[PDB]
Amino acid sequence: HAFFKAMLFMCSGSIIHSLNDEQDIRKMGGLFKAMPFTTTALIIGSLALTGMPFLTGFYSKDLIIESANTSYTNAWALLMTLVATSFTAIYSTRIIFFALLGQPRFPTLININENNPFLINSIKRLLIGSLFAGFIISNNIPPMTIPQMTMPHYLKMTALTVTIL
């Protein structure tokens, strides 16, 4: 989560400073191919959200819903986490569609500029940490719990099912 949203905020605020302090979803329309380093960055963030299988964002959320689904829980809480997984999928889809993949609404006299070694260094190295380093962490953790790992059908598939729907 830390690597994830550091990368996401840094990319989005870069876009904000590139496009004149507006920061709002409207009047921010068309940005894909307006240099796609940051649009690549933002959609890598939003696909690491909900855990595309199986990436840095996979491990945390998906082992959480597995171990929560296979325990003596409250029978409202698991349903709430499930529905909120669907909801985090849908607003991440909204931030993609309105920010980067729309017909261009933003005011003219445009000064789109990202010829910066600093920012390409920062975005570069944080997507590096957001593609491999989740596996570098999650691989050799000292195992300090007992994994469940024996799920039925429609309880390990439920993660990908909810995110796709």
Partner 1 sequence: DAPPLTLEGIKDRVLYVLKLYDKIDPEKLSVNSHFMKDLGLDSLDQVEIIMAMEDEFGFEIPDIDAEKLMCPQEIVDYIADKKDVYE
Partner 2 sequence: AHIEPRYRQFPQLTRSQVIQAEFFSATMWFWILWRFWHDSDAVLGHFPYPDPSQWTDEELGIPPD
Partner 3 sequence: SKMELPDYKQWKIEGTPLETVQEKLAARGLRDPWGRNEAWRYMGGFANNVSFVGALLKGFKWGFAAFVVAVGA
- Contacting residues toward partner 2, per CB under 8 A: 33-37, 39-41, 44, 52-55, 108-115, 120, 124, 127, 131-132, 135, 149-153, 156-157, 159-160
Rounded to whole angstroms, the Cα distance separating 116 from 58 reads 31
Structure tokens at 105: 């609404």
> Per CB under 8 A, does 65 bind partner 3?
no
Stretch that binds partner 3, among 30-38, 59-67, 111-119, 155-163 (CB under 8 A): 30-38
**Cβ nearer to partner 2, comparing 6 with 34:** 34
> Which of residues 107, 117, 142, 143 is near partner 1 by CB under 8 A?
107
Do residues 10 and 38 lie in contact, with contact meaning Cβ atoms separated by under 8 Å?
A: no
Burial profile 124-144: b = 16 or more Cβ within 10 angstroms, e = fewer:
eebbebbeeebeeeeeeeeee
In eight-state DSSP terms, residue 25 is S
Among 101, 128, 149, 157, binds partner 3 (CB under 8 A): 101
